[PDB]
Amino acid sequence: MYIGIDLGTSGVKVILLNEQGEVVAAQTEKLTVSRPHPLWSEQDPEQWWQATDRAMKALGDQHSLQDVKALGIAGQMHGATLLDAQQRVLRPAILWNDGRCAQECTLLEARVPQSRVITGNLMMPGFTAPKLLWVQRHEPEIFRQIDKVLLPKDYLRLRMTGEFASDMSDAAGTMWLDVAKRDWSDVMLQACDLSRDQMPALYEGSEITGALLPEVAKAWGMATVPVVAGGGDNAAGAVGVGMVDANQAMLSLGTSGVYFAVSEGFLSKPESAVHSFCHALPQRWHLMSVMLSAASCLDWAAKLTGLSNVPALIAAAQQADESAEPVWFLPYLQAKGVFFGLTHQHGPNELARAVLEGVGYALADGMDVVHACGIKPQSVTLIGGGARSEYWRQMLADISGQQLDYRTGGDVGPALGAARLAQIAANPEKSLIELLPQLPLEQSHLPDAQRYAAYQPRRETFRRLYQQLLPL
Amino acid sequence: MYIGIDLGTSGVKVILLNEQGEVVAAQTEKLTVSRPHPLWSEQDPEQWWQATDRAMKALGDQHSLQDVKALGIAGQMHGATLLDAQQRVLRPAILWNDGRCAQECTLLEARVPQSRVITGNLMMPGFTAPKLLWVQRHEPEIFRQIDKVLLPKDYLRLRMTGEFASDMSDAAGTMWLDVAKRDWSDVMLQACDLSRDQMPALYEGSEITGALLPEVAKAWGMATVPVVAGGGDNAAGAVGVGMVDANQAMLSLGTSGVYFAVSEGFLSKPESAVHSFCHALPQRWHLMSVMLSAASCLDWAAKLTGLSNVPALIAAAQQADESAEPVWFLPYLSPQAKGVFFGLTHQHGPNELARAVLEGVGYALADGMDVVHACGIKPQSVTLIGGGARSEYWRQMLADISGQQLDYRTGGDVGPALGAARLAQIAANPEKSLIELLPQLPLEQSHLPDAQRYAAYQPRRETFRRLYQQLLPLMA
């Protein structure tokens, strides 16, 4: 039996995996956010713990955790948790979506010209590093008391084991990690008046970082079970879904269209919408791009044409007349809908076809920006709610020229990846290949050479068209 | 009683008018176009006759044409009908929307510089003169035979009366006419290597040019009634509505958008998209400009939106979110418009889109009229007709945008055919004036521009123009 904990933003989810990778139980505990000022997004670390501790006790109450062999955690990335020399929480946690330190972002980058090379990323406000630069400037007294800076998931580890550890995936998200070397970057820390002494110890996601404090062990009805490093939500998310080896990639369609891809070694493209990170497994890295916004984007056009169901415009999209207008929908990305109008003089199911293809071109280019970094998948697992239309799925295949394997499941979340990482650490024998399955294949879409060849020139809209036009 | 004929491009329509000037009957017969190579728009002069004939009989089966005293005719402009000495058709008619002669246009204007001055227009392939210069180049054998060149309705006339004639408003659209002098231009003809002998005889549209040949009068069940010169569909249509004196103008929001204005003398604004032609009346000229059809845009938008009737559109437009950012609908005219929807967000639904259309079309029409006015035209109020003008909300939005008073009148359902019949009445009753003979359509409603709403639209028009000119390139 294994435990998997995920410290999300809305709450914490804790799961119980049976000896063969199946989810026997689950518990979720809501978590609120605190917005003291515009752009501020904070959480009380003691609320993360209380939620976790309730979830666990709620889980073991259902079924005894007296057989759990290992435990893993995953959490919201980038959150800064400042603790004093006695492990006490100085100020609330500044979350991934907190955008108060934009200016400290410029400062840091001016302080280390080679910042984007090191972290492989552009310095953003949600990132951990610039927040501490902010605390130093706005709350000097609290900054002076800093002994340790922990990410959300890791603060939780501290409460369970008394240890100070993190995993490469989550660590890289701090902008203090030298992503390539998978180790703290001194230049980075120094630029923030911080030192390794204030960072937790680094582990690969599947490595054991400590055991459960006896107290905790007793409070939850389980032994002093070992606790693995785990990973940040994205990485632990892919782990639980089997997205592990090089050139493996997935798209989720979405309340975000997110493209996540495992690379061979460290790749990066800062000046783009591409984010680079370490994976939650040894010698593995990944890249990812957010995209649409093919749920929003598509409901909008369904109401726009008097339709109310997205299923409807997909159907409508289908009877478009092979009148080729062709249409030409440009989407923009807040988010908001830079929403480029079009070209036309025909119908609603003809416009339904335009919208669906506009999104499709936007996605194709998103994945191509990733691929041009050094990734070339043989196939692309496709999962999510916005991916239930076989028709739209097949369109994305013909547009991008990527084999799209549709798969069901993928609803558990990072928690499943946290329990999987725990299974790995508990079964040094079995091979990863044995402990990391994928979601059950639901369909496989191969690009229709006919439509594919006709589309590549069509995508010559999201060529000069999308570019001549901003001005937004 | 009176007959009018309209040789359209797709139909022909014949109406019967009573001594009062009201419609008693009407009939239509369809035609089709040939579209052989691309840019080629051809038609069979014979298909016109069969269609016209069928209709007249059909009109007759409805009412008796025994009391008809005079007959008028109007037709599609600029079409080019080539006949040999035996009065035979050398080749299909190159319609107004044919474009095989773009080269020949430039060549003519190069051979005749004062050309825009003489004709008062910008050479376009739809015009007659460049088409013949084309035939001379590509089909020189067919050119060697040209004995006469006739406009669509005039070919129709020859078949009805054995007469070779045309009216000034239709002859003006050939570019062989010195529009200011109401007479052919030898300069323009010599350039196309043509001669007056190959041109028909010119008349004011209200002048009789012949009479129905006995067997024609016979088959159609009417006497050998006189036939007037008539006018091009535009000029004719204008006579029907009553557009007869300087600074009288009308905006047609039908399937065919046109802004027509009777000028004070011959006004020449060639470099513009404003056209200057002779009116179908004595001593009368005009300017005209092609516009959008409102009532094709309003239909298209009502469906794009799922709103299924144009009154729902206009209602929706009125329910738009006063807080949602502006959406710009840029209508590009080639009822073929191409259109752009700039600035669409999560906040923008069918109601907001409804309103973007009405404004875009309205802004487009206000600018169209403005171009013609800056030309010299000074209408106090403008007559508004067409199906696109049925909605009152929208008559007012349009008044408010344009800043022009709009007198909405009923009965432009009839078309140029009413004009034809009108010109016929003028010839038949030579003692009567035009005041009595060309009334204006009944006043349905007068829209005075709202000062506040006007001032409000003003910066929005300016932004529509910038945005329009900015995408113009991405257009054609």
Q: Which of B306, B329, B345 sits opposite A305 (nearest CB)?
A: B306
Classified as helix, coil or strand, B18 is coil
Take residue B117 and report the two structure tokens written for it.
């001055």
**Among the listed residues A252, A369, A253, A351, the one whose alpha carbon sits nearest the alpha carbon of residue A301:** A351
Greatest extent of chain B over all pairs of C-alpha atoms, in Å: 71
- CB atoms closer than 10 angstroms to residue A195: 11
From residue B291, give the alpha-carbon distance in Å to each of A64, A469, B202, B388.
Answer: 79, 27, 29, 12
Q: How far apart are CA A70 and CA A212, in angstroms?
A: 10
Chain B partners within 8 Å of A305 (Cβ): 304-306, 350
DSSP state for residue B379 in the 8-state scheme: -
Question: Which of B241, B273, B298 is where one domain is finished?
Answer: B241
Q: Which of A306, A336, A345 sits opposite B338 (nearest CB)?
A: A345
Using DSSP bridges, classify how beta strands B201-203 and B165-167 pair: parallel, antiparallel or unpaired.
parallel
- What burial class does residue A78 get, using C-beta atoms within 10 Å of its C-beta: 0-12 exposed, 13-18 middle, 19+ buried? buried
Q: How far apart are CA A286 and CA A272, in angstroms?
A: 15
Mapped to the 3 state alphabet, what secondary structure does B264-296 carry?
CCCCCCCCCCCEEEECCCCCCEEEEEEECCCCC
B265 dihedral zone (left: phi>0; alpha: psi -120 to 50; beta): left
Contacts of residue B12, Cβ cutoff 8 Å, sequence gap at least 6: B5, B6, B28, B29, B31, B48, B51, B52, B55
From residue B85, give the alpha-carbon distance in Å to each of B42, B145, B198.
Answer: 22, 8, 10
Give CA angle at A214 (A84, A72), nearest 5°.
75
Q: Are B228 and B156 in contact (CB under 8 A)?
A: no
How was this structure determined? It was done by X-ray
- What burial class does residue A233 get, using C-beta atoms within 10 Å of its C-beta: 0-12 exposed, 13-18 middle, 19+ buried? buried
**Nearest chain A CA: its distance from B298 CA (Å):** 11
Q: Are B460 and B403 in contact (CB under 8 A)?
A: no
CA torsion, ordered A48, A49, A50, A53, to nearest 10 deg: 120
From residue B98, give the alpha-carbon distance in Å to each of A113, A428, B353.
Answer: 64, 80, 35
Q: Which of A293, A297, A300, A304 to mutate to test the interface with B (most CBs of B within 10 A)?
A: A304
**Among the listed residues B127, B119, B121, the one whose alpha carbon sits nearest the alpha carbon of residue B178:** B119
Q: How far apart are CA B238 and CA B281, in angstroms?
A: 10
For residues B220 and B280, state if they share a domain: no
For residues B235 and B246, state if they share a domain: no
Contacts of residue B352, Cβ cutoff 8 Å, sequence gap at least 6: B320, B321, B324, B327
Q: How far apart are CA A222 and CA B384, in angstroms?
A: 86
Q: How far apart are CA A381 and CA A243, in angstroms?
A: 9
Chain A partners within 8 Å of B474 (Cβ): 465, 468
Note every long-range contact of B323-327, with CB atoms under 8 Å and residues 24 or more positions apart, other chains counting.
B323/B347, B324/B348, B324/B352, B326/B356, B326/B460, B327/B352, B327/B353, B327/B355, B327/B356
**Among the listed residues B31, B30, B28, B4, the one whose alpha carbon sits nearest the alpha carbon of residue B18:** B4
Concerning whether A233 is annotated as a catalytic residue, the answer is: yes
Take residue B10 and report the two structure tokens written for it.
């797709």
- Subunit contact A345:B307, Cβ cutoff 8 A: no
Backbone angles phi, psi at A399, to 5 degrees: -80, -50
**Among the listed residues B214, B209, B245, B215, the one whose alpha carbon sits nearest the alpha carbon of residue B229:** B209
Q: Give the DSSP per-residue string, B147-214.
A: -EEE-HHHHHHHHHHS--EEEHHHHGGGT-EETTTTEE-HHHHHHTT--GGGS-EEE-TTSEEEE--H
Chain B partners within 8 Å of A300 (Cβ): 346, 349
Classified as helix, coil or strand, B145 is coil
Using DSSP bridges, classify how beta strands A42-43 and A23-30 pair: parallel, antiparallel or unpaired.
unpaired
Determine the residue of chain B that is closest to A350 in CA distance. Answer: B304
For residues B301 and B344, state if they share a domain: yes
Mapped to the 3 state alphabet, what secondary structure does chain A carry?
CEEEEEECCCEEEEEEECCCCCEEEEEEEECCCECCCCCCCEECHHHHHHHHHHHHHHHHHHCCCCCCCEEEEEECCCCEEEECCCCCECCCEECCCCCCCHHHHHHHHHHCCCHHHHHCCCCCCCCHHHHHHHHHHHCHHHHHCCCEEECHHHHHHHHHHCCCEEEHHHHHCCCCEECCCCEECHHHHHCCCCCHHHCCEEECCCCEEEECCHHHHHHCCCCCCEEECCEEHHHHHHHHCCCCCCCCEEEECCCCEEEEEEECCCCCCCCCCEEEEECCCCCCEEEEEEECCCCHHHHHHHHHCCCCCHHHHHHHHHHCCCCCCCCCCCCCCCCCCCCCCCCCCCCHHHHHHHHHHHHHHHHHHHHHHHHCCCCCCCCEEEECHHHCCHHHHHHHHHHHCCCEEEECCCCCCHHHHHHHHHHHHHCCCCCHHHHCCCCCEEEEECCCHHHHHHHHHHCCHHHHHHHCCCCC
Residue range of the domain that includes A208: 1-241
**Among the listed residues A11, A208, A172, A156, the one whose alpha carbon sits nearest the alpha carbon of residue A78:** A172
Q: Are A268 and A115 in contact (CB under 8 A)?
A: no
Q: Are A278 and A182 in contact (CB under 8 A)?
A: yes
* Residue reference for tokens 């923009």: A332
- What burial class does residue B342 get, using C-beta atoms within 10 Å of its C-beta: 0-12 exposed, 13-18 middle, 19+ buried? buried
Q: How far apart are CA A101 and CA B30, in angstroms?
A: 72
Contacts of residue B147, Cβ cutoff 8 Å, sequence gap at least 6: B83, B84, B85, B87, B198
Q: How far apart are CA A75 and CA A81, in angstroms?
A: 13
Take residue B126 and report the two structure tokens written for it.
């739809």
Enumerate the β-bridge partners of residue A59: none
Is A78 annotated in some ligand binding site? yes
For residues A378 and A443, state if they share a domain: yes
Q: Provide the CATH number for the domain around residue A130.
A: 3.30.420.40
- What burial class does residue A352 get, using C-beta atoms within 10 Å of its C-beta: 0-12 exposed, 13-18 middle, 19+ buried? buried
Q: How far apart are CA B219 and CA B77, in angstroms?
A: 27
- E strand or H helix that includes residue B225: none
Q: Which of B167, B233, B299, B407 is catalytic?
A: B233
In one-letter notation, the amino acid at residue A193 is D
- CB atoms closer than 10 angstroms to residue B141: 9
For residues B209 and B251, state if they share a domain: no
For residues A182 and A281, state if they share a domain: no
Q: How far apart are CA B276 and CA B255, in angstroms?
A: 22
Classified as helix, coil or strand, B320 is coil
Classified as helix, coil or strand, B19 is coil
For residues A176 and A298, state if they share a domain: no
From residue A446, give the alpha-carbon distance in Å to each of A298, A383, A397, A452, A458.
Answer: 24, 16, 6, 10, 19
- E strand or H helix that includes residue B223: none
Question: Which of B220, B241, B262 is where one domain is finished?
Answer: B241
List the 351-370 stretch of A: residues with Cβ below 8 A of B: 351
From residue A93, give the alpha-carbon distance in Å to each of A149, A154, A350, B424.
Answer: 10, 12, 49, 90
* Residue reference for tokens 């006497």: B223
For residues A258 and A166, state if they share a domain: no
Q: How far apart are CA A101 and CA A120, in angstroms?
A: 20
Q: Are B475 and B338 in contact (CB under 8 A)?
A: yes
**Among the listed residues A119, A196, A153, the one whose alpha carbon sits nearest the alpha carbon of residue A4:** A153
Whole-angstrom Cα Rg for chain A: 23
Q: Are B121 and B276 in contact (CB under 8 A)?
A: yes
Backbone angles phi, psi at A115, to 5 degrees: -85, -40
For residues B320 and B227, state if they share a domain: no
From residue B159, give the alpha-carbon distance in Å to each of A24, A179, B164, B215, B324.
Answer: 93, 90, 9, 11, 61
Q: Are A259 and A288 in contact (CB under 8 A)?
A: yes
For residues B249 and B110, state if they share a domain: no
For residues A326 and A252, state if they share a domain: yes
The number of domains in chain B is 2
Take residue B187 and report the two structure tokens written for it.
């300069």
Chain B partners within 8 Å of A340 (Cβ): 341-342, 344
Enumerate the β-bridge partners of residue B265: none
From residue A147, give the alpha-carbon distance in Å to each of A81, A88, A250, A440, B298.
Answer: 11, 10, 39, 46, 69
Q: Which of B341, B361, B463 to mutate to test the interface with A (most CBs of A within 10 A)?
A: B341
For residues A428 and A297, state if they share a domain: yes
List the 312-341 stretch of A: residues with Cβ below 8 A of B: 336-337, 339-341
B342 reaches A (C-beta below 8 A)? yes
| Entry resolution (Å) | 2.7
Q: How far apart are CA A205 and CA A234, in angstroms?
A: 13
Contacts of residue B430, Cβ cutoff 8 Å, sequence gap at least 6: none
From residue A156, give the alpha-carbon distance in Å to each of A159, A218, B226.
Answer: 5, 17, 103
Note every long-range contact of A375-378, with CB atoms under 8 Å and residues 24 or more positions apart, other chains counting.
A375/A247, A375/A249, A375/A261, A375/A262, A375/A263, A375/A267, A375/A287, A376/A247, A377/A247, A377/A248, A377/A249, A377/A261, A377/A402, A378/A247, A378/A403
A111 reaches B (C-beta below 8 A)? no
Backbone angles phi, psi at B27, to 5 degrees: -150, 145
Give CA angle at B249 (B245, B255), nearest 5°.
135
Q: How far apart are CA B469 and CA A303, in angstroms?
A: 30
Q: Give the DSSP per-residue string, B343-376.
A: ---TT--HHHHHHHHHHHHHHHHHHHHHHHHTTT
Classified as helix, coil or strand, B97 is coil
Chain A partners within 8 Å of B336 (Cβ): 345
Question: Which of B226, B241, B256 is where one domain is finished?
Answer: B241
- Helices B350-373 and B451-471: crossing angle, nearest 10°? 90
Classified as helix, coil or strand, B82 is strand
* Residue reference for tokens 């302080």: A111
